Ligand binder design. Structure first.
Ligand SMILES: *[B]([O])([O])[C]([C][C]([C])[C])[N]C(=O)[C]([C]C1=[C][C]=[C][C]=[C]1)[N]C(=O)C1=[C]N=[C][C]=N1
Lengths: 219, 206, 245, 230, 272, 238, 204, 229
C-alpha cells in the first residue's frame, strides 16, 4: 500500500493506490482506500481490509453522532483521538496503518497513526508497504506553501514510486483534495499502466458445455 | 478409529453394524459391547470413539429426545430434527472450554407419518456425521480404520433395491473384509436394522 | 392518590411535585446572582454575604472552576452546588481523555441536564436543589473568533442559552430590570465597563440596599484572557461608584 | 406526615427535614470550641462522662487524621467515626498517589461531599455530627466546620454544641490576630468551664488538642499539665 | 422507599391476584377479535376503531405479515392481540425470537403448542417475580403443524392458555361465545368458516351491512409450495404444500363481506 | 410514634429509636460484671440456675484469642456473629504480625462493625453488649460496647438485667482495684455479681462463669471443676 | 490446513444484466471423498444467491446463523433483504468473531430486481469487504480460478454466453486441483428468471 | 434500590399513571406536521420565556440522521433521552447494514423505550410525545408516538396545547395531491391561527425532509416563507 499525504497552502491532499492482494495474487485492482470521516476529514488506510474499514466506519459514525450533539464542525484532533485509543487498546492486533487529513478552524491537520497507536503530526506523511519509496519523492520535492496543482502532482508522482517499484501496490492513483470549503475526490487522476494488448476474446458458443439437468424458475 | 461402523440404507430398511471391541491401548477389555444406542423406537445412532465421551454424548442426546417427548405429549420428532440437534452439540463443543467430543457417528432412522396431516418423508434416513460437526445425508457411511476397505466395497455391490436377505449377505461381506485386512481384531459386529416396525437386533450376521 | 407529592410520580394535572419543590430550594437561602454577556466578555455577579463576623470570608464562595475555560456559579442549596461541580469536572475531564479537545460550553450544559433528568425520573433519587450557570467562551466557526456564552440548567433539566439571567431570591425583580434595560440598547454591542454597571444595578434593584463591594464576588471571562478568573475587589469599587453616578 | 420520613423528600417550601432533624442531634450534644492563632489552630471539647468508673482517655472526640490535620467531631460519637475513618482514607490517598500532604481546604471539601452524599438517597440517613477539621498544611493554619447538610466553611473561631450561643460571644473577646497557641489553651478551656453548668452532670472534663509550629506542625493532644484545673 | 410498593405479586385475603384480574378487565375494553378453526384452514377476524381521515397507510412491501390487529410470528404461526397495544410488541418480538431459535437448534417448524407454552411462561413470570405489573394482553395463536394440524389457542394475562375450536377476546366476548356455540360443526369448509367469522363479528358491534373500513381479517391455510429447490438439496425432501399466513385486502374481503350480510338477510326474512 | 419503625429515620427531637430499642435488649440479658485490676481483668457472668435438678447450659463467655475474651448480654445469636468477626480479625492479625492484637485497636474495630449496621435501611443493629477482657504491652484493658456503636473504656462496669445494683457496688470500690491481688480481685467481682441476683438466690459453681486474663495468664474460663476454689467459700454479707 | 480440510470451490461472474454462480460437488477429509452430490450454494430470495467454502462444520453453522438473521430481518422489516444490505450484514458477522474466527469464505452474488445492477462481494475469513465489478472466487482451487476467469472475461456478456465461460473456468481449474471436482452445479440468474444447471465433470 | 413498579392497573382496568402522562404530554407548545407527494414538513413553536433567553440557542426540531427528523411537545428533558437513544439506534443500523434506517423500524425501536419504562421497576413513564418524519426506500412518512408506546402513521397531525382545534383545521385544508411548496404554505398557516402574537424567524422552527434529507431550514430560508403567507 502506498498511501501518502501533503499539506499545501490551504488544506491537505491525500493519495492512495488501488491494488489489494490476498497472498501474492492480486485480489482486486480497483479497491478504494481513501475513506470518509466527516465533510472536512478524509482518512487513507493500509494493512488489512477488514481492520481498516471497521476502525473507520465506527469512528466516522461516532464523529457524526457527536456532531448532532454539538451542532458544530468536527475537529480533526478529535478524529485522531478516537483512532489512537482504539488502535492502542488492541495492542497492534488491529493491523491498520492510517493517514488522517482534514481542515478545521485552526488550519490543515495532517497526521498519521501507527498500528500500535502512536501519532505523528507532520507536513507530509507516507504509510503502507511502499511508504519508503514514496517518501523519497516527497523528501526531494516538497516545499512550503505549494499551490493546489503543484501539490496534487507531487502526491500523484509519489504514488507512482510505489506503483512501479512496490509489488504490493499499483494500477491507479487515487487523489483526494481537502480544502476549507469543499472536498474534491478524483479516482482516475493518473492511470500510468493502461491496458496493453487488449484481449483476444476466445469465443465459445452457447450450448457447448454438456449439461445433465436444468431447471428454469420464472419470476 | 480402531473400531468400525458400517451403515447403508435401502428401499425399506437401514442396516447398521458396529464392532463391539473395547481396548486399553493394546489389551482387549471386551468383545461384546453395544455401541449402537437406541435413541427412539425408530431411531438409533452408531457412535465410534473411546468410551469416555461416547456414553456421555449419547446419554445427553437420548435424554433430551425423551424430554422433548415429555413436554410435547409423546410426539416423535423427525429424523432430520434429531440429526440437526446432534451436530449442534458437536459444533458448539469445538469452540468451548471442555473441548471437542471425539465421537464419530452414523445416524439412522425411518420416517413414519405421525398423523394424517403429515405429508413429510416416508422413506428411510441415514446421516453421516463427524467429531467436528459435519452433517451429510448419504446412501452409505463408514467410520474407522476399515471404512475405506468397505466404502469401496459398497461402491461395487450396493443397490437401492436390495431386499432384507440380499442386504444381509452384503453386510456379511462387509464384516469379512474388516477381518481380512485390518490389523485390529474386530470379531463381533452387532448388526441391527431399522424398518417400518421399529428396530430389530439381527442375530445371524456377526 | 394516597401521597400525590412524595416521590417522582405524575400528578393528575400532569406535573411533578418534586420538581416544583426543588425550585423553592433555590430561593430558600435568600441569595441572588445575575449573569450578563457583553460584546466581548461574560460576567457573573452574585451576593457574597457572610452574616457571622467570625467566619473566614475567603472560604465560602459560589464561583467555581469547572475547566480552565469554563466557570460556574451555583445558586440554590449550597452543598448541592458543590456536588454538581464535581460531576461537571468529571464530565469535562472524561471528555478530554476520550475526545482530545476541551468540552464546549453548550455540550457541558447538556450533559449536566441529562444528569438532572435521571434523578427526577427514578423514584429513589433526590433532585439537586440548585440552579447552575455555566459561563464561558466558545470557539466560533467559519471565522475562528471567540464568542461569549451563558448557559443555565434548572433542577428539572431545562438547559438553554441566555443573554442575561438571574437566579435566587427575588429573581423576578432582577429579570424585570434587565428586560427594562433591554428595551433601550442592544446588549450584544455594549462593552465590559457598560455591562458591569447593569448586572450590579440589577443586583441593587432587587435587594434595595446598594450593597458594598465585599458583599459580592464577580467572575469573568474575556476574549483576550479566555480563562475563568474572579475579579479583584478593587475593580468592583470602580464599578459601584459608576452606578451611583 | 410522610414528608419528613426520608432524605429524598423536599418539603412544600424546599426543605429537607431529615437533614434538619440531624442538626438537632448536634445542638443537643456536648460543647465544642476552636480557635485559629496565626501559627496554628487549637481545638477543645468537653467529655461528658456518664459514670465515675470511665478510664481517663475514654470517648476522646479528637482524632488524628493526618500528621498535620485532625478532625474533632461534635454530635454522635459513632456516626462521626465514619467521618474520621473516611477522611483518613482521603488523606492516605494524597500521600500514596500524589506524594503530597493533603491541603486543609481540600480535606474539608472531601468531608463535606461524604456527608452530603448520604442526604440525597432514600436508603441512607444523614450524620448526627458536626466535624471540625483543624489542619496546618502548606496553605497555613486552617479551621473548617462541616455540618450534617454537607456545608463546609472556613472559620476563625467556632462554638458548637448545646451552649454554642453563649460560647460564641466568649470567642468575640479574643483577638485571633495577636492570639498565640501558648495562651489560647488556657483561654479556650476557660470558656468551657464558664459556659457549662454542673447542675445537670457531675462528671465533665475537657480535652484540648492543637497543631502549630511549636509541636513541629504535628497534630498532637496536650501534655496533661498545660490545661487549667477548673 | 419500601412504603410505596404497590405489592403486585401478593395474594388477596381470599386468594386472588388483583393485578391479573384488573389486566383481564383491560382486555374487556380492547378490540374484539374472533377466530374459528375449520378443517382446511383457520381464519381470524377482528375489529379496529374508526378511521379518521388523516390516518395514513405505512406503505410496506409484501403485506401479509403486519396488519393493524393480526401479526405474523413465523411462516407457520400467526396471532392477534387484544389488550394494551404497546405491551404486545414486547411479547410479539419474544414470540418471533423463540420460534426462530427453535429452527436454529432443530431445523424444523415449531409446534403451535410449543410456542404457546413458551410465551405463557413469560407472562406468568411477571405475575410472580419482580414486583411489577404483569402483561395486560391476550393472544390468539393460530397455525399449522404436522403434529395435530390446524390449531387455535387462547392466552390469558396470567400464564394460562387453552386450546379451542372457536374463541373470542375483547369487547363482548361472553356474547360472541354463545353465538359461535349456536352454530359450529366439525366438517366445515373455509368459506363456511369465514362466513361464520364475519357474521358473528357484526353481532357484537350491532351492525348490519358489515363495513370494510372497520374489519380486519387474516386466514391461516396451506398453499401449494412454490420455492422447492431439489437441485441444491439432493437428499432433502420438500413437502407438497406449505402453510402461509396471509391477510386479506379490500379486494379479497369484499366478496366475503357481501356473503355475510346476505346470510344475515337470509335469516332476516324468516324472523316474524 | 411514627418515627420508630425504620432505622434510617431521625425523630423531630433528634433521636434514633431503633438504636434506642436495641439498647433494651442488653438491659434484659443476664447480668455480667467486669472488674479490671493492675495486671488482671476478671469477668464474672451469671448463667442460668438449674430447674430443681435439670441443668441447662448456654455459652456466654467467649475466647477471642490468647489475650482477649468477652462476655455477652442480650441477643446471643448476634453475640456469636460478633464472635465470628472478632476471632477472624485476631487470626488475621497474628498471621501478619506474629503477635497479639492491641486492645485499643480492637475496641476501635468493634465500633466500626456496629456502625455499618446502623445506617443502611435493610440492616439492623446488633442487640447485644460486650465486655472485652484484654491484655497487651500497655497492660490490662476492660471495654464495653453497646448497640449504638459506642465503646467505653472502664475501670469496672456491669451490664444485664438489674445490673444497676451491681454498678452501685462497684462505685464504692473502684478506687481500690490497682492495689488488690488476684484473689481479692475475683472477690470484688463476685460480691458485685451477687447483688444483681433475685431475692432468694445466692452464688455457687452452678450459676457463675469466672473468666480471668492476666500478664502471664492467657484467657482462662473457670467453669465447674476449677471454679470451686473461689466459690465454695463465699457469702454475700450485708 | 483447516481452510482446505473439506474442499470445494465457489466462484461468480458478472454480466450485463445477469450474474452466474457455480460450486463443485465434493466433500472430503483432506484426501478421501465423503460425498459426491453436495453443492455449496444457498438461495435466500429471488435476487441474492451466496456460496460458502472452507470448513464444512463452519459452512453449515454460519449458514444457520445467516438464515436465522435473514428471516428475522423479514419479520422486523416488512421487505426482502437487498444485496448491499445482505453483504454488509454478514461482513459484520465475520468481524465480531475476529479472534475466534469462522473458517468460511462467503461468495455473495446479488442483483437489483428493479434497476438491474449486479453486486459481487467476496470477504475473507475475518470479514474483509471487497467488491470487484468483474468476478469473485474462493475455495481450494482459488489460485487456479484467477487465471481462468481473468483471461476469458469481457464486460458485455449475454446470460447464455456467460454460463459457457464460467463452466469452462470451473472445470479446467478442478482438473488441476485434487480437492475439488466431481462435476459442478451452476446457477445463472437475470432480472426475469433463475435457471439452475448441473454440469458434466470428471469423476476423478 | 426501589425495584418495584410505579405504574400499575386500576380497579377500572386502566393504567392511570400513563393517563396522567398523556396530560403532561399535551401541555407543551403546538408542534405539527403535514405530508405531501414530494416531502414532509414539520413545524414547531419556540416559546421564549423572556426576551433574554437566546432564541437562536433553544431548538425543538431535532435532526436524527441524514434522513430522519423529530419534533416534540411535552417535557423537554424527558425528550432528550428519546432523541439520544434514537440518534444512537440509527447509527447502529448503518454500522450493520450500510443503509439508512426506515422510518418504520426507528419508531418501533423508540416505542420499545416508552413501553420499557411503563413496565420497569422504580421509574415513571415519559411525559412527552414525538413527531418522527423522514424518507426511506418506500416513500415519505410521518409518525407520532405516545407516552404509552402506541405509535401511529398519520398524514397530517398536531400535538400540544391548541392541538384539537388545529387538527380540525388540518382536515379542512389537506388535499391528496398537495405539493411540497403547498405543504409549507399551509403548515405555517395552521400555526398562526392558534398563535398568540406575531411569529418571526426566531420564533418558530421548521424542517422539511426533501428527497433524501431532512435539512432544518435556516433563518434566511424561513424568513422567505413568513412574508409569503
Ligand atoms: B495495500 O497493499 O494496498 C493493501 C491495504 C488495503 C487493501 C487495506 N494491503 C493489502 O493488499 C492486503 C494484504 C496486505 C499486504 C501487505 C501488507 C499488509 C496487508 N490485502 C487485503 O487485506 C485483502 C485481502 N483480500 C481481499 C481484499 N483485501
Amino acid at each position: 500500500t502506498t498511501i501518502v499525504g501533503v499539506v499545501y497552502r490551504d488544506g491537505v491532499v491525500l493519495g492512495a493506490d488501488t491494488r489489494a492482494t490476498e497472498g501474492s495474487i492480486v485480489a482486486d485492482k480497483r479497491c478504494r482506500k481513501i475513506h470518509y470521516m466527516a465533510p472536512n476529514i478524509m482518512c487513507c488506510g493500509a494493512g488489512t481490509s477488514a481492520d481498516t474499514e471497521a476502525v473507520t466506519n465506527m469512528v466516522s459514525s461516532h464523529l457524526a453522532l457527536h456532531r448532532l450533539e454539538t451542532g458544530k464542525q468536527s475537529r480533526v484532533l478529535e478524529a485522531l483521538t478516537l483512532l489512537k485509543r482504539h488502535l492502542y487498546r488492541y495492542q497492534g492486533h488491529v493491523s491498520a496503518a492510517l493517514v488522517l487529513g482534514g481542515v478545521d478552524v485552526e488550519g490543515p491537520f495532517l497526521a498519521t497513526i501507527a498500528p500500535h497507536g502512536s501519532t505523528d503530526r507532520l507536513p507530509f506523511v507516507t504509510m503502507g508497504s511502499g511508504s519508503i519509496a514514496a517518501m523519497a519523492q516527497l523528501e526531494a520535492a516538497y516545499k512550503d506553501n505549494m499551490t493546489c496543482e503543484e501539490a496534487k502532482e507531487l502526491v500523484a508522482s509519489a504514488i507512482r514510486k510505489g506503483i512501479f517499484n512496490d509489488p504490493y501496490s499499483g494500477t491507479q492513483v487515487d487523489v483526494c483534495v481537502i480544502t476549507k470549503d469543499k472536498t474534491e475526490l478524483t479516482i482516475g487522476y493518473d492511470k500510468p499502466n493502461e491496458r496493453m494488448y487488449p484481449r483476444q476474446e476466445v469465443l465459445l458458443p452457447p450450448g457447448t458445455t454438456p449439461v445433465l439437468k436444468e431447471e428454469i424458475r420464472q419470476l | 478409529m480402531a473400531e468400525t461402523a458400517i451403515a447403508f440404507r435401502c428401499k425399506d430398511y437401514v442396516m447398521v453394524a458396529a464392532a463391539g471391541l473395547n481396548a486399553f491401548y493394546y489389551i482387549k477389555i471386551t468383545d461384546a459391547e453395544d455401541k449402537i444406542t437406541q435413541l427412539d423406537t425408530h431411531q438409533l445412532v452408531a457412535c465410534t470413539g473411546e468410551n469416555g465421551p461416547r456414553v456421555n454424548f449419547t446419554e445427553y442426546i437420548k435424554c433430551n429426545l425423551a424430554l422433548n417427548r415429555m413436554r410435547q405429549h409423546g410426539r416423535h420428532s423427525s429424523c432430520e430434527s434429531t440429526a440437526n440437534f446432534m451436530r449442534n452439540c458437536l459444533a458448539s463443543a469445538i469452540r468451548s472450554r471442555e473441548g471437542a467430543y471425539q465421537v464419530n457417528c452414523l445416524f439412522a432412522g425411518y420416517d413414519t407419518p405421525v398423523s394424517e396431516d403429515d405429508d413429510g418423508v416416508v422413506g428411510p434416513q441415514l446421516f453421516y456425521m463427524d467429531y467436528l460437526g459435519t452433517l451429510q445425508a448419504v446412501p452409505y457411511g463408514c467410520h474407522g480404520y476399515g471404512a475405506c476397505f468397505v466404502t469401496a466395497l459398497l461402491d461395487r455391490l450396493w443397490r437401492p433395491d436390495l431386499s432384507q436377505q440380499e442386504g444381509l449377505e452384503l453386510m456379511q461381506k462387509c464384516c469379512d473384509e474388516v477381518k481380512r485386512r485390518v490389523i485390529i481384531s474386530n470379531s463381533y459386529f452387532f448388526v441391527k436394522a431399522v424398518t417400518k416396525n421399529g428396530v430389530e437386533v439381527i442375530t445371524a450376521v456377526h | 392518590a394516597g401521597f400525590d407529592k412524595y416521590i417522582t410520580v405524575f400528578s393528575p394535572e400532569g406535573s411533578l411535585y418534586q420538581v416544583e419543590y426543588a425550585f423553592k430550594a433555590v430561593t430558600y437561602p435568600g441569595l441572588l446572582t445575575v449573569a450578563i454577556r457583553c460584546k466581548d466578555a461574560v460576567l457573573v455577579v452574585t451576593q457574597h454575604l457572610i452574616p457571622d463576623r467570625l467566619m473566614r470570608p475567603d472560604s465560602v464562595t459560589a464561583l467555581y472552576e469547572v475547566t480552565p475555560n469554563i466557570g460556574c456559579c451555583m445558586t440554590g442549596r449550597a452543598p448541592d452546588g458543590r456536588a454538581l461541580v464535581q460531576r461537571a469536572r468529571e464530565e469535562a475531564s472524561d471528555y478530554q481523555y476520550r475526545y482530545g479537545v476541551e468540552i464546549p460550553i453548550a455540550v457541558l450544559a447538556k450533559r449536566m441536564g441529562d444528569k438532572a433528568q435521571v434523578r427526577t425520573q427514578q423514584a429513589g433519587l433526590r433532585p439537586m436543589g440548585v440552579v447552575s450557570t455555566f459561563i464561558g467562551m466558545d470557539q466560533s466557526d467559519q471565522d475562528g473568533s471567540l464568542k461569549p456564552q451563558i448557559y443555565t440548567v434548572d433542577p428539572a433539566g431545562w438547559t438553554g442559552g441566555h443573554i442575561a439571567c438571574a437566579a435566587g431570591k427575588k429573581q423576578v425583580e432582577a429579570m424585570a430590570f434587565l428586560e427594562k434595560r433591554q428595551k433601550s440598547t442592544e446588549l450584544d454591542a455594549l462593552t465590559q465597563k457598560e455591562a458591569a454597571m447593569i448586572a450590579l444595578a440589577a443586583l441593587q434593584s432587587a435587594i434595595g440596599t446598594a450593597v458594598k463591594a465585599k458583599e459580592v464576588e464577580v467572575g469573568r471571562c474575556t476574549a483576550a484572557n479566555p480563562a475563568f478568573q474572579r475579579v479583584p475587589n478593587s475593580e468592583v469599587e470602580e464599578w459601584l461608584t459608576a452606578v451611583a453616578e | 406526615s410522610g414528608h419528613d420520613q426520608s432524605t429524598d423528600v423536599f418539603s412544600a417550601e424546599g426543605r429537607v427535614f431529615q437533614v434538619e432533624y440531624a442538626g438537632k442531634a448536634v445542638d443537643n450534644s456536648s460543647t465544642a470550641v476552636a480557635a485559629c492563632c496565626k501559627d496554628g489552630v487549637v481545638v477543645a471539647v468537653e467529655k461528658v462522662h456518664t459514670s465515675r468508673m470511665l478510664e481517663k482517655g475514654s470517648n476522646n472526640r479528637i482524632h488524628a487524621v493526618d500528621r498535620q490535620a485532625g478532625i474533632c467531631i461534635c454530635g454522635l460519637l459513632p456516626d462521626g467515626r465514619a467521618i474520621v475513618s473516611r477522611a483518613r482514607q482521603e488523606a492516605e490517598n494524597s500521600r500514596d498517589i500524589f506524594a503530597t500532604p493533603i491541603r486543609g481546604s481540600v480535606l474539608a471539601n472531601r468531608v463535606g461531599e461524604f456527608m452530603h452524599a448520604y442526604t440525597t438517597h432514600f436508603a441512607y440517613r444523614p450524620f448526627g455530627c458536626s466535624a471540625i477539621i483543624a489542619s496546618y498544611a502548606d496553605d497555613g493554619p486552617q479551621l473548617f466546620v462541616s455540618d450534617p447538610s454537607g456545608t463546609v466553611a472556613g472559620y476563625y473561631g467556632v462554638a458548637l454544641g448545646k451552649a454554642k450561643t453563649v460560647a460564641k460571644s466568649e470567642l468575640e473577646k479574643l483577638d485571633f490576630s495577636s492570639l498565640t497557641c501558648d495562651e489560647a489553651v488556657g483561654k479556650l478551656a476557660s470558656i468551657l468551664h464558664e459556659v457549662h453548668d454542673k447542675q445537670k452532670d457531675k462528671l465533665y472534663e475537657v480535652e484540648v488538642a492543637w497543631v502549630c509550629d511549636k509541636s513541629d506542625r504535628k497534630f498532637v493532644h496536650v501534655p496533661a499539665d498545660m490545661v487549667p484545673a477548673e | 422507599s419500601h412504603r410505596y410498593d404497590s405489592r403486585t405479586t401478593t395474594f388477596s385475603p381470599e386468594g386472588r391476584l388483583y393485578q391479573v384480574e384488573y389486566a383481564v378487565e383491560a382486555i374487556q375494553q380492547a378490540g374484539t377479535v374472533i377466530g374459528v378453526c375449520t378443517k382446511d384452514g383457520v381464519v381470524l377476524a377482528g375489529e379496529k376503531m374508526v378511521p379518521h381521515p388523516l390516518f395514513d397507510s405505512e406503505s410496506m412491501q409484501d403485506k401479509n405479515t403486519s396488519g393493524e390487529k393480526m401479526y405474523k410470528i413465523a411462516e407457520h404461526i400467526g396471532c392477534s392481540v387484544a389488550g394494551v397495544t404497546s405491551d404486545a410488541y414486547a411479547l410479539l418480538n419474544y414470540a418471533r425470537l423463540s420460534a426462530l431459535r427453535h429452527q436454529y437448534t432443530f431445523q424444523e417448524p415449531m409446534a403451535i403448542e410449543d410456542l404457546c407454552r413458551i410465551l405463557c411462561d413469560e407472562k406468568q413470570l411477571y405475575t410472580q417475580y419482580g414486583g411489577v405489573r404483569p402483561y395486560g394482553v391476550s393472544f390468539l395463536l393460530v397455525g399449522w403443524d404436522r403434529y395435530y394440524g390446524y390449531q387455535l389457542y387462547s392466552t390469558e394475562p396470567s400464564g394460562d392458555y387453552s386450546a379451542w375450536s372457536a374463541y373470542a377476546i375483547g369487547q363482548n366476548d361472553q356474547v360472541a361465545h354463545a353465538l359461535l356455540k349456536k352454530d359450529w360443526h366439525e366438517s366445515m369448509t373455509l368459506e363456511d368458516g369465514m362466513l361464520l367469522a364475519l357474521r358473528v363479528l357484526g353481532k357484537t358491534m350491532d351492525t348490519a351491512k358489515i363495513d370494510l373500513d372497520r374489519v380486519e381479517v387474516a386466514v391461516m391455510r396451506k398453499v401449494p409450495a412454490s420455492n422447492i429447490d431439489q437441485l441444491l438439496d439432493p437428499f432433502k425432501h420438500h413437502p407438497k404444500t406449505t402453510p402461509r399466513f396471509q391477510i386479506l385486502t379490500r379486494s379479497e374481503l369484499k366478496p366475503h363481506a357481501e356473503r355475510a350480510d346476505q346470510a344475515r338477510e337470509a335469516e332476516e326474512k324468516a324472523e316474524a | 410514634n411514627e418515627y420508630d419503625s425504620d432505622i434510617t429515620t431521625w425523630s423531630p427531637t433528634g433521636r434514633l429509636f431503633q438504636i434506642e430499642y436495641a439498647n433494651e435488649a442488653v438491659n434484659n440479658g443476664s447480668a455480667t460484671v467486669g472488674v479490671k485490676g493492675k495486671n488482671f481483668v476478671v469477668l464474672a457472668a451469671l448463667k442460668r440456675s438449674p430447674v430443681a435438678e435439670l441443668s441447662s447450659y448456654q455459652e456466654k463467655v467467649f475466647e477471642i484469642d490468647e489475650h482477649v475474651g468477652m462476655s455477652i448480654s442480650g441477643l446471643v445469636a448476634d453475640g456469636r456473629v460478633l464472635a465470628r468477626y472478632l476471632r477472624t480479625e485476631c487470626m488475621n492479625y497474628r498471621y501478619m504480625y506474629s503477635n497479639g492484637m492491641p486492645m485499643n485497636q480492637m475496641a476501635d474495630m468493634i465500633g466500626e462493625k456496629h456502625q455499618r449496621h446502623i445506617q443502611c435501611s435493610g440492616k439492623r443493629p446488633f442487640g447485644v453488649g460486650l465486655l472485652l477482657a484484654g491484655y497487651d504491652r500497655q497492660g490490662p484493658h476492660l471495654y464495653q460496647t453497646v448497640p449504638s456503636g459506642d465503646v467505653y473504656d472502664y475501670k469496672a462496669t456491669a451490664m444485664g438485667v438489674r445490673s444497676q445494683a451491681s454498678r452501685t457496688y462497684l462505685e464504692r470500690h473502684f478506687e481500690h482495684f490497682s492495689d488488690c491481688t488476684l484473689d481479692e480481685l475475683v472477690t470484688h467481682a463476685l460480691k458485685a455479681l451477687a447483688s444483681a441476683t433475685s431475692e432468694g438466690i445466692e452464688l455457687n459453681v452452678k450459676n457463675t462463669t469466672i473468666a480471668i486474663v492476666g500478664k502471664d495468664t492467657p484467657f482462662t474460663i473457670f467453669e465447674e471443676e476449677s471454679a470451686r476454689k473461689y466459690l465454695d467459700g463465699f457469702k454475700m454479707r450485708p | 490446513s483447516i481452510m482446505a480440510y473439506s474442499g470445494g470451490s465457489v466462484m461468480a461472474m458478472a454480466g450485463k444484466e445477469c450474474f452466474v454462480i457455480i460450486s463443485d460437488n465434493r466433500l472430503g477429509e483432506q484426501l478421501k471423498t465423503i460425498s459426491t452430490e453436495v453443492p455449496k450454494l444457498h438461495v435466500v430470495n429471488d435476487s441474492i444467491v451466496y456460496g460458502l467454502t472452507g470448513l464444512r462444520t463452519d459452512q453449515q453453522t454460519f449458514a444457520n446463523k445467516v438464515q436465522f438473521r435473514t428471516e428475522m430481518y423479514k419479520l422486523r422489516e416488512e421487505r426482502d433483504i437487498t444485496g448491499k444490505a445482505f453483504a454488509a450484514m454478514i461482513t459484520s458477522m465475520l468481524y465480531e468473531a475476529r479472534f475466534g474466527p469462522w473458517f468460511v469464505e462467503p461468495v455473495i452474488g446479488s442483483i437489483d430486481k428493479s434497476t438491474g445492477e449486479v453486486y459481487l462481494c467476496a470477504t475473507d475469513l475475518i470479514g474483509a469487504p471487497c467488491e470487484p465489478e468483474d468476478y469473485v472466487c474462493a475455495g481450494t482451487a482459488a489460485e487456479s480460478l484467477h487465471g481462468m476467469c481473468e483471461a476469458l472475461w469481457r464486460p458485455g456478456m449475454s446470460p447464455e454466453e456467460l454460463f459457457e465461460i464460467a463452466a469452462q473456468a470451473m472445470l479446467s481449474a478442478c482438473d488441476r486441483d485434487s480437492l475439488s471436482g466431481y462435476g459442478a452445479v451452476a446457477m445463472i440468474v437475470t432480472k426475469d428468471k433463475v435457471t439452475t444447471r448441473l454440469i458434466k465433470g470428471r469423476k476423478d | 434500590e426501589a425495584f418495584y413498579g410505579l405504574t400499575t392497573f386500576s380497579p377500572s382496568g386502566k393504567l392511570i399513571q400513563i393517563e396522567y402522562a398523556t396530560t403532561a404530554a399535551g401541555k407543551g407548545t403546538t408542534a405539527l406536521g403535514v405530508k405531501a407527494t414530494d416531502g414532509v414538513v414539520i413545524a414547531a413553536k419556540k416559546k421564549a420565556p423572556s426576551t433574554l433567553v437566546d432564541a437562536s440557542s433553544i431548538q425543538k426540531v431535532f435532526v436524527l440522521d441524514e434522513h430522519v427528523g423529530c419534533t416534540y411537545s411535552g417535557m423537554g428533558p424527558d425528550c432528550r433521552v428519546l432523541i439520544d437513544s434514537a440518534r444512537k439506534n440509527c447509527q447502529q443500523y448503518k454500522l450493520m447494514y450500510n443503509e439508512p434506517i426506515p422510518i418504520s423500524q426507528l419508531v418501533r425501536k423508540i416505542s420499545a423505550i416508552y413501553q420499557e419504562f411503563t413496565q420497569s421497576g422504580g421509574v415513571r413513564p415519559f411525559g412527552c410525545s414525538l413527531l418522527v418524519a423522514g424518507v426511506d426506500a418506500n416513500g415519505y412518512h410521518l409518525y407520532q408516538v405516545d407516552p404509552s408506546g402506541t405509535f401511529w402513521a398519520w398524514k397530517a397531525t398536531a400535538i400540544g396545547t391548541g392541538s384539537p382545534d388545529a387538527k380540525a383545521f388540518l382536515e379542512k385544508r389537506y388535499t391528496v395531491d398537495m405539493e411540497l411548496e403547498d405543504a409549507v404554505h399551509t403548515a405555517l398557516l395552521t400555526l398562526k391561527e392558534g398563535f398568540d402574537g406575531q411569529m418571526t424567524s426566531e420564533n418558530t422552527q421548521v424542517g422539511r425532509v426533501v428527497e433524501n434529507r431532512f435539512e432544518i431550514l435556516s433563518v434566511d430560508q424561513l424568513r422567505d416563507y413568513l412574508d409569503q403567507i
